[PDB]
């Protein structure tokens, strides 16, 4: 048996993964996903993606879980920088553009995008931040363009020696080796607050059978046991909000 909320909206992952224009990594986008049902199997079975690193979850278990909110962050980077979109990584991108937390729960999804994102004379639309005094915090976004003072002399918004524009362009070109080609990245962030879950897989609810040994699934809590009526107050049915005691068996 399987008890999920009665959410029915489709989660708008299409306009994230399939958007025609992507953000620069220093200016990465975030789409907040809530109150909807997403079919992650479209994602974790697709052949479009070249990386699918999931932390704190296994990608194929994703159609049996629920979360409070999902965040979808997206941007473009070089190919050989994809490895830096990971917890604990260091470098220009992970320290100064997009940083993941210690305890990240989510998936990093990426695919080569040379056809869409490189131009013949170089696509200078896609930038990254090269200079910054301090590290970004996890999931922090800085889009400032103040001239970077590398020396003691103030810059007064005039760039010159020891006075650098903080952003640097990738200049993607079609003949670039694969590690210098642009990749589109989507980071899925599965958030689990103490609240009703609003983003679920597409698994269909069945009848709530009590008083009997059953394999169950309550918003992602999977066990084998007998659900009975419970006099405790504070697993709870999503649809009916009723408390159920669990006793094990086989």
């Amino acid at each position, epitope marked *: 048996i399987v008890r999920f909320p009665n959410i029915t909206n489709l989660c708008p992952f299409g306009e994230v993964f399939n958007a025609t224009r992507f953000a620069s990594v220093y200016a990465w986008n975030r789409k907040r996903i809530s109150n909807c049902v997403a079919d992650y199997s479209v994602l974790y079975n697709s052949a479009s993606f070249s990386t699918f690193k999931c932390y704190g979850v296994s990608p194929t278990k994703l159609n049996d879980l629920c979360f409070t909110n999902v965040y979808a962050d997206s941007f473009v980077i070089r190919g050989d920088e994809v490895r830096q979109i990971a917890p604990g990584q*260091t*470098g*220009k991108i992970a*320290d*100064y553009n997009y940083k993941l937390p210690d305890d990240f729960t989510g998936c990093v999804i990426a695919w080569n995008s040379n056809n869409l994102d490189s131009k013949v004379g170089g696509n200078y639309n896609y930038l990254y931040r*090269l*200079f*910054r*005094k*301090s*590290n970004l915090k996890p999931f922090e976004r800085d889009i400032s363009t103040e001239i*970077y*003072q*590398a*020396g*003691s*002399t103030p810059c007064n918004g005039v760039e010159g*020696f*020891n006075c*650098y524009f903080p952003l*640097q362009s990738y200049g993607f070109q079609p003949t*670039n*080796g694969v*590690g*210098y080609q642009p990749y589109r990245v989507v980071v899925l962030s599965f958030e689990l607050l103490h609240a009703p879950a609003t983003v679920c897989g597409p698994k269909k609810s069945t009848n709530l059978v009590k008083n009997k040994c059953v394999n169950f699934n309550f918003n992602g809590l999977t066990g084998t046991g007998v659900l009975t009526e419970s006099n405790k107050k504070f697993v709870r049915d999503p649809q009916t909000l009723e408390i159920l005691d669990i006793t094990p068996c086989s």
Partner: antibody
Amino acid sequence: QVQLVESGGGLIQPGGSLRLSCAASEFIVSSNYMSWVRQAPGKGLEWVSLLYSGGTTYYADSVKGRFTISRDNSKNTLFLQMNSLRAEDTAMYYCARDRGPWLHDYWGQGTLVTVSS
Amino acid sequence: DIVMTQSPSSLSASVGDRVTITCQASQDINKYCNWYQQKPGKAPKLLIYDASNLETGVPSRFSGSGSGTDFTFTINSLQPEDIATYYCQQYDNLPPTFGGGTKVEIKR
């Protein structure tokens, strides 16, 4: 007016420790990528280690776990802590400002480290 | 770990000659090849960053081209002040590595 002045070199016995420093003018060391590059007598160039403005460090495999890069913002000085020094660590040691990682656009005149008993 | 094979290791030319040095990277490094000039007892000086760009102050006689694996460094009319050892470097892929260097001597 920009300057990088290394000091602290000298003769030091194998297995011993040594700290190089590199005092800067006009560059703020804590606002720059800063590298150490070394040159063994009559030989080519070997990058040693790199300090990001934000504190990230990188080391050449041949010194990893033995050398440590650091700074003192007040003194506007970069350090290279050397431990368990070895014969083949003997070299002239340069500090350099990096206009972006490993883009060595300004080099000090170096300090000479001789590893011998 | 990228290897920078620099050619030739020594060169002997006359004032005003056109001196070409090449560097081949063992992997694609796009354009992230720099060129340094070292005079005896001095520290290296950056002359060309990003395969082809001239550091401010550097005479127009110096130039460079290339992208991918094959790089060229050129002194257009060699001068007395250009006696030095020249090194290429790839500075994008960890660890950065230098070529073996090219010792340049004036012919007389």
